[model samples]
Target chain A: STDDLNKCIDHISVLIKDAYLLYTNESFATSTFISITIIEEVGKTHIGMAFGSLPTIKMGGRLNKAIGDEMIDKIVEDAETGELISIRESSLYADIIDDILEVPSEKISKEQSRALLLYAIECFDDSLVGYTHHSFEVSETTDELFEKLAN
Target chain B: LKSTDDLNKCIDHISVLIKDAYLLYTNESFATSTFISITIIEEVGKTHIGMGKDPLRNHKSKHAFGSLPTIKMGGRLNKAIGDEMIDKIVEDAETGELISIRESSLYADIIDDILEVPSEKISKEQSRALLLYAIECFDDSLVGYTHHSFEVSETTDELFEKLAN
Candidate 1:
């Protein structure tokens, strides 16, 4: 028996397949995983430009890193999106293999750590274009609905 | 890589081969050596003389003319080559190979005398001269003689280890 929503035995899984589609989709809005705090730490404009494209955040405003403040809203959104991507990757073969992905952290070896870092750094930069497009589409649809209701 | 057991096994195999070749060459040299040093001991009425002369007679020597039958100084020349050949073999054994061309001469002699027939076809000079060029080319390069190269590098003198059950 498997839970429909919770694919992993633990909650920290990334739904990568869905997130990947969203990230690469140019037709919609933004959907990347890494938060502004990490993006700021990495000192890259790509993060600011990617997330700043959302209608909620002005086009060029820098992501704030205030602790437990409204500035952390974007950070939470980024974390959720990142977790979703993680869950998707782990769960793709999970259904076929019965989704028993609860291997202990200690069992993860140096090889596995190297592989994960390689995969994340090389395969996906976390600046997902497709998801950005999807976000734009949702934001546009919601705006249009709000306009029609107000009229 | 040098500390690995596999390298140790390779050195051991090479050591055995070197020892085998050394012992064979030394045995042959020793056989010929027995005829090289010939001594005769005789007691002549309170005097002992060797080859019609006393060993310690001012110039002739008296040790050879000692009244007692001690004269046990006959095997040094006979066994000299044996010791030298064994040391040379052991030298090649520990290093697997070396910079010395003399060693290659010994190796070639082993092959020519023992492995191949018609020993006359491969004279000692021919055997010694064959490896001369390789020796001269690698003259200043003792790097190949190291234990690391003995186990891995395919340098001139070194044979790479290809281990199996």
Candidate 2:
């Protein structure tokens, strides 16, 4: 339902706004960590909407189940092994890998944070590729956040 | 060598996390709400680093679980549900139950070699448990830190400013 999906995007939008504020304030580690969170969530939004909407669509409808499944698989794989997954932990906590110690602030650089932020932005755009007609205005909070961040 | 900034930041972050968690839970966005709750665990974990400099441990193996005991604050929280609950949540975190829930749900996980999406694994009951679990952590974490309990908003930013004394 659009109601459920709207809240999902609202949650992600909250995350994005927090991330943007942190980034603007130079809290890059937290900002970058939050961006990584946004990627998986936006992925979840796409998957949830696809399946949730599929049952009600007519044969004339363009909501392809196979297409939805492929998107789900790719997003899952990205979550499975991506460096973003690895950094999400390292960027949030202090840890030891094997025998060496790692700290959150030391693990992420400004450039690294910037790159992940960019990637997160792209994923959100790409994830919504087929669903643009479904009253995105319900999720306008995200649109609102993106403009502020971009500006 | 010692600074309270991170601990104070933990308070500010946790306040916001609680606020966000409640809104999502109310909306019945269970999985997202559940993921939001898990973050309080991470922020609580940050306290272990800030209160004392611990290089070898983390909010993981120890990073998160460690904060649980401190926030328990000498049985104030452990009175009934806190002990077993605290023990259980800590044990859950130590055994990887804690972080994995946040991970598998926010992202995805492979169980039995099958792919799963993040949203379907949680429910309203699960979200409520995690939500209550987090509130206890939040209440006690505040008490443990500032001799305070159960309040919200920018009071934390003000709370942060007063710690110099």
Candidate 3:
């Protein structure tokens, strides 16, 4: 079962990376959900690794609170810079933080899954910048314009 | 208004807005709900930073949500929102066996909550619901003294006004 989990993580890593690249390549309005779905998947993987079961608030809550200010800082910094670097190594260590939060014994073997997660995270982090900065303004204006149109 | 009793009067009122926000979250579009949530956070931040100025204006011009400026803005805003309220909500969420918004699992909880039981538990959903409830409670509780704030725009005002009715 762990093997199945490992395979799933590996496959998802590729998918996440592909999706990440896809969203970055083009900023279509419809494409925004691509990253959102990936973001959700990354969250699920995070929950799965920490809980070793389907996502639950009980365990997921603990892990979520455990996310340090430092990691988010890194993400914000990277997003601001618009740089795309490998966060693979960095996120593995990030998972180490989760292990402590989830308690050593309760943590799942995300050895491979962690990579998938990190890739997905980088995509999400990067895409958030693209979405919020590049695509959001025009999209937002259109929605507002539509309201005026109806009015 | 310096006295604890005077402050409590203000807090009691802001608490109503907080509840209103939660109700909107439950009943409205996710986009609308998020807008209201941010409205509360931003309003609280504006009150702390002063009404005429934005603590994140420069950052907003140059950065997005995940940027350092935005994150710093969020940190300052969270502080402005007050630890007592934040901590109380965290405790309340746990009391309900729910997840807090700070947790990355909020959407999961929402999905699980909407889905059938067993395959998924409503713990996360309950957590979010309680968390939303507490935000309103805190917002209203602070009302007497704090300035009402939101993302200011004619459209936003219209949307919020429509929702209010």
Candidate 4:
């Protein structure tokens, strides 16, 4: 189980590494998408760690977690922002109110993607800094995630 | 990697996904077609809104971009549907509903403590609607397009007849 989540963290790191590339490549919406996924992946990781099991990992999308308000306070503590929380819960994609499209090509700044990227790095780092389980390591330090990504 | 080549390849590959979705739809594999249907619509969005390109393997590209903004190609649907219907297609094209449908189209998930298989999650009617919506979504994204030459033409023609008939 710990092995599952350790590999999980590495995957999260890959996502972060990817966020930078997509962001760099100007695939901003995709970067935003992955960053949000990173947050929710960490969210699911939080849920799985609570149960100390594997089901939550496989049920990977942001839906159907069935978490309630009080439990959300715990999720918020880990995820660390109501804005990020609302982005997680509320309208995904971009919103179209009236007839105006949000996140239009000519108008989409790096603001949200950039901000979401920051939160992903924060949340993942916070996760491991506080993480240690009675379960799962030690074969390949060469298996190390590169520094730029983990940082 | 945004370039002239990326633009052509992006729409061209999506044309292939459209072809693929229809074949699955033809075989009466509604659930699988429904999965490909979402892939079709989001690639439409990625091409227009995000300008995201090749491999289309980015789960974010497939799953996420459509929810952001519409890059409607201003086709017949826009004329026929108007903005309410136009926005409505995209509004329908998006959401957690799409993700739920995509996953349910593939996995056996328990709902309310009952295990339901993928086929049970989609119907011929719903899957066709989803596929037709993808066609419309792609049609709208084809707003400025000029269809050009390509190497592959066989099954793509089947999709043409299938789309027509």
Tell me the spans in candidate 3 whose CA falls farther than 4 Å from its real position. Answer: A1-40, A43-151, B1-96, B100-135, B146-165
lDDT of 4 by residue, B1-165 (tens): 144444454455556556656755776667667876876676566555443123553565545545544545664434433456445545554545676677777544446855455665688866766666676655555424443423333334445445544
Q: Which regions of candidate 1 deviate over 4 angstroms?
A: A1-151, B1-3, B29-117, B128-165
Best by TM-score: 2
TM-score for chain A as predicted in candidate 4: 0.54
- Measured by lDDT, the strongest candidate is 2
Error of 4 at A65 (Å): 45
Q: Give candidate 2 regions above 4 Å deviation.
A: A1-34, A38-122, A127-151, B1-7, B49-63, B70-90, B144-165
In order, the Cα lDDT scores of the candidates are: 0.25, 0.56, 0.33, 0.52
Alpha carbon deviation, residue A7, candidate 1 (Å) = 87
For candidate 1, the TM-score is: 0.16
Q: How large is the interface RMSD of each prediction?
A: 37.6, 7.8, 17.7, 11.4
Q: Of the pair 1 and 3, which is ahead by DockQ?
A: 3
lDDT of 1 by residue, A1-151 (tens): 1221111111111212222222233201111221111132122223422223222333223222112235234334644466433432222111112322221121223222222222222122333322343434333433333233223
Please give each candidate's TM-score: 0.16, 0.50, 0.25, 0.41
* DockQ each: 0.00, 0.10, 0.02, 0.02
lDDT of model 3 at position A84: 16
For model 2, report DockQ: 0.10
Share of native interface contacts present in candidate 4: 0.00
Tens-place lDDT per residue, model 4, A24-67, is: 65655555655666666666666655212112221422211322
Error of 3 at A11 (Å): 17
Ranking by TM-score: 2, 4, 3, 1
Of candidates 4 and 1, the better by TM-score: 4
